[PDB]
């Protein structure tokens, strides 16, 4: 009975036609050192919360720092 797709978003950025061209190459986009400590968690479009990337046993996940 599964409804929703949760998305784990490391980084978002609004981007210009210029900066778009520059990435079609292989030019580096600069993330802070601290990106993995605010991974946005998005359901079908909307932002639900935010958290640090964690590893439990086999899998990866996001320990929730803030929510709804």
């Amino acid at each position: 009975p599964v409804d929703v797709k949760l998305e784990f978003v490391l980084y978002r950025k609004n981007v210009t036609l210029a900066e778009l061209e520059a990435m079609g190459q292989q030019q580096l986009l600069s993330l802070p050192t601290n990106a993995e400590l605010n991974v946005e968690i998005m359901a079908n479009g909307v932002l639900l919360g935010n958290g640090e990337l964690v590893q439990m046993n086999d899998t990866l996940g996001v320990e929730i720092h803030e929510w709804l």
């Binding site: 009975p1 599964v2 409804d3 929703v4 797709k5 949760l6 998305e7 784990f8 978003v9 490391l10 980084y11 978002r12 950025k13 609004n14 981007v15 210009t16 036609l17 778009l20 990435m23 079609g24 292989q26 030019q27 580096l28 986009l29 600069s30 993330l31 990106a35 991974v39 968690i41 998005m42 359901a43 639900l48 958290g51 990337l53 964690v54 439990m56 899998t59 990866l60 996940g61 996001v62 320990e63 929730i64 720092h65 803030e66 929510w67 709804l68």
Partner: protein, 65 residues
Amino acid sequence: PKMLRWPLRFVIGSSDTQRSLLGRIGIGDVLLIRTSRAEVYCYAKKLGHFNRVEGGIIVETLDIQ
């Protein structure tokens, strides 16, 4: 007029859950990434994959449609 923007998401994962198991979720709970990716999205379109490096991100061949 070239004052245009595209909103990009750097997605590292997906998980299918039940709309009814949140907000049973609160702070401290771990949500697991069942499907693991490194794709770039613009709205629904996937544009291509990306590699995380010490500076941030480098993107492989990125689609433009």
